[PDB]
Amino acid sequence: SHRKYEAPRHGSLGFLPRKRAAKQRGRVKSFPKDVKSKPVALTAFLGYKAGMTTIVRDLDRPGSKMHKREVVEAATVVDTPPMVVVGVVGYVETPRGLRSLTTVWAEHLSEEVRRRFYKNWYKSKKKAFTKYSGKYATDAKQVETELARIKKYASVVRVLAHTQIKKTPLSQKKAHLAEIQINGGSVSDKVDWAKEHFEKEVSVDSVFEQDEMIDVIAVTKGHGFEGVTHRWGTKKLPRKTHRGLRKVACIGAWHPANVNWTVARAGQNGYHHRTSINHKVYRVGKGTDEA
């Protein structure tokens, strides 16, 4: 028999499985599409969520009842010290998708990013990138050869940059290293830009302007194992129900003689990877500004 009354489904089937993210660092699934006519520029930046605040703002929206009138709005502060460029990756177009061809690194990597490559840094000889650092010996033609290979074959160029987490109040000493795609200009222009920025800091004001709409990639707040009532927003059963009420009463019809993937079940809630779009930039603050 049909439902006696209609109701929408509880929750979205487009965010399955409701499992923990594989990594805590949110990964850019898709980068902005590259336009050659634009200047060479980064397409992403890494920051740390500091907290939320409140602002007051005059609204400029003609036809609104709040037009030219003050609004009080919630805002989020993202601590973003400049990122350091340490590498560059070339990607090749193949009938099976993008494939990384070569990764070229900078000569000197700071300790905070070399800790990224260790589970037990304090017990180590800290040998990472020492032979590679020797590859720069007095002519650095190996590095130039790899860069020429990237220029010759790569269609997508991404830089390798890490956060300067020592400038944040966090007690963690590992930097966060991510690939940020370079858009604009030819492939040769991108490779030259990446090389000239090795061991240099890149600030947010070179990536984001004020009034921009930007997207946020992050792993949400973890809540652990959760029942269906709060995981999926299902209706609580009556007070007098035997064996409890924070359940889904019917988890399936007799046929299919299986539990369907579309039924709400208890499981891990939160700590999901999300891509959230259209967040307006109210302020790109400067660390040196005392106001």
Binding site: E93, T94, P95, P256, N260, W261
Partner: protein, 199 residues
């Protein structure tokens, strides 16, 4: 009819099911087959008809868990692979070995770009279909249902054909020089005797 170490088939202009049946019998009988340019394969019937058929195929999925159901592959090589695998007892060890004897590709990747590709006349569209009938190119059917790398393959196929044309121009030049050398040694004692033997 010779037993070959590998038979590399140029899949351009071949009807999907006829090539699939021939390749199935070939790999069951212990012959290694490579099919290249699966994006240039053909199915009889107009494009819309075959697209409707593929959408009928897409309808089919396990109700209680979509991850268990049929896995609808969109690449042209995988469409040919599904056609072939339907003609193989793939759930036995012998069918599994026979399927290990087979490789299917879009384009002509290495090392087969410098090898000999043959055709299969019993499965060629220009030789099988009545000259007025409509047909589909599997490359267009694949793009219409989700295959993402059509334009990548054609960019790489144009690069391969430019290189393959340089090969042929060089090979043609050395054939012309060798023919001029064989003309000089004609009407010689060895050449006259070889003409009486049929050579």
């Amino acid at each position: 009819s010779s037993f070959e170490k590998v038979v590399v088939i140029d899949g351009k202009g071949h009807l999907l099911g006829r090539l699939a049946s021939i390749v199935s019998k070939q790999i069951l009988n212990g012959q290694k087959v490579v099919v290249v340019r699966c994006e240039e394969l053909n199915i009889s019937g107009e494009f819309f008809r075959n697209k409707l058929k593929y959408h009928d195929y897409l309808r089919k999925a396990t109700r209680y868990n979509k991850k268990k159901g049929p896995f609808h592959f969109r690449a042209p090589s995988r469409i040919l692979y599904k056609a072939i695998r339907g003609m193989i007892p793939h759930k036995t060890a012998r069918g599994k070995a026979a399927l290990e004897r087979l490789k299917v590709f879009e384009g002509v990747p290495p090392p087969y770009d410098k090898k000999k590709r043959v055709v299969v006349p019993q499965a060629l569209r220009v030789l099988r279909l009545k000259p007025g009938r409509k047909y589909t190119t599997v490359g267009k059917l694949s793009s219409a249902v989700g295959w993402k790398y059509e334009s990548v393959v054609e960019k790489l196929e144009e690069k391969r054909k430019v290189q393959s044309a340089e090969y042929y121009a060089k090979k043609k030049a050395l054939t012309k020089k060798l023919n001029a050398a064989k003309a000089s040694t004609a009407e010689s004692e060895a050449a006259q005797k070889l003409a009486a033997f049929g050579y």
